[PDB]
Design a binder for this molecule. Structure first.
Ligand SMILES: CC(C)C[C@H](NP(=O)(O)CNC(=O)OCc1ccccc1)C(=O)NCC(=O)O
Ligand SMILES: [Ca+2]
Ligand SMILES: [Ca+2]
Ligand SMILES: [Ca+2]
Ligand SMILES: [Ca+2]
Ligand SMILES: [Zn+2]
Length: 316
């Protein structure tokens, strides 16, 4: 909407206070004009029609329980925009500052979040498996990264390409979580998963097997559930990414870590210059090796480490 840029204040899902960019025209709307062509947050009102209504508030204060998922979706979309712009020189998900749209309060007891082809969508959870999912910065960045993937490599959402698609979202979700630097880790969704259980998460990149996911190509799932295991087999690539960054010895294969920034540069280049809609794991290995070669040179430690990591997870 047309209006003047303002700064509201509120509390997120975890009870933390933050400032948010809003727009004033009669009401204060969750419309952040400071980033690209805007970040817009909508109320789905417990229903499934999308996007719902642009979030309107009378006083620019967002401290109601109902406000919390909107505050975090809006704010963490901003952080994710900043990561892509500042770290990768990418302007929004399409590279041309497309408006970023999110809807919260989707459906009832909805234990998931997704990119629907046009926007991000967040359930509130059922209060047992999840609390409102926008409370996780890794979750928000995971969802926006699906949009980046769709506009770039275009990895088809099934089987190996789909598992790469998922891993790309977990990798950048995690790198955004480190960028914001609040309780960062290599776990996925820990901030909004199972409020009654401490110390767990939906997935782990450092040890995917902790939550039943494969950490070696020999353990890949090839059934039909979960689109051919896109959230399962992602563990193989998540493990490789973790090893590239942090190092370690996995099934006897030692990897020299090169750090998060270089992991991010290598995978961003692979995503945007080499991967295609049908890439499999072997082709991802080749893309990451080529990307590291471009950035650091054929004889570099970075290239050697990428090879070590894929060797470690059984991907040739
Ligand atoms: C980071 C998580 C908290 C949320 C994350 N959600 P996600 O991977 O975006 C869900 N994916 C999804 O719904 O894809 C199906 C789809 C939806 C809409 C259009 C096209 C395809 C997840 O791992 N979900 C688990 C699952 O769906 O099994
Ligand atoms: Ca208010
Ligand atoms: Ca964390
Ligand atoms: Ca995390
Ligand atoms: Ca938990
Ligand atoms: Zn996903």
């Amino acid at each position: 909407i047309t209006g003047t840029s303002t700064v509201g204040v509120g509390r997120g899902v975890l009870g933390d206070q933050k400032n948010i960019n809003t727009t004033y025209s009669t009401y204060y709307y969750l419309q952040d004009n400071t980033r690209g062509n805007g970040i817009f947050t909508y109320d789905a009102k417990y229903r499934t029609t999308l996007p719902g209504s642009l979030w309107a508030d009378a006083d620019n204060q967002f401290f109601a329980s109902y406000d919390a998922p909107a505050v975090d979706a809006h704010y963490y979309a901003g952080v994710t925009y900043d990561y892509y712009k500042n770290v990768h020189n990418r302007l929004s998900y399409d590279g041309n500052n497309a408006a970023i749209r999110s809807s919260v309060h989707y459906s009832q007891g909805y234990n998931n979040a997704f990119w629907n082809g046009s926007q991000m969508v967040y359930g509130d959870g059922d209060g047992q498996t999840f609390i409102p999912l926008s409370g996780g910065i890794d979750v928000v960045a995971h969802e926006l990264t699906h949009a980046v993937t769709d506009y770039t490599a275009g990895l088809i959402y099934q089987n190996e390409s789909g598992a790469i698609n998922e891993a790309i979202s977990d990798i950048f979700g995690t790198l955004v979580e480190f960028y914001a630097n609040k309780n960062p880790d290599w776990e996925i969704g820990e901030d909004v998963y199972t409020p009654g259980i401490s110390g767990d998460s939906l997935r782990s990149m450092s040890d995917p097997a902790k939550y039943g996911d494969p950490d070696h190509y020999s353990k890949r799932y090839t059934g039909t559930q979960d689109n051919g295991g896109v959230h399962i087999n992602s563990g193989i690539i998540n493990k490789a990414a973790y090893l590239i960054s942090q190092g370690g010895t996995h099934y006897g294969v030692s990897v020299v870590g090169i750090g998060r920034d270089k992991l991010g540069k290598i995978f961003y280049r692979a995503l945007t210059q080499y991967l295609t809609p049908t890439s499999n794991f072997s082709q991802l290995r080749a893309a990451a090796v080529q990307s590291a070669t471009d950035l650091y040179g054929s004889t570099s430690q970075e290239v050697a480490s990428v090879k070590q990591a894929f060797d470690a997870v059984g991907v040739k």
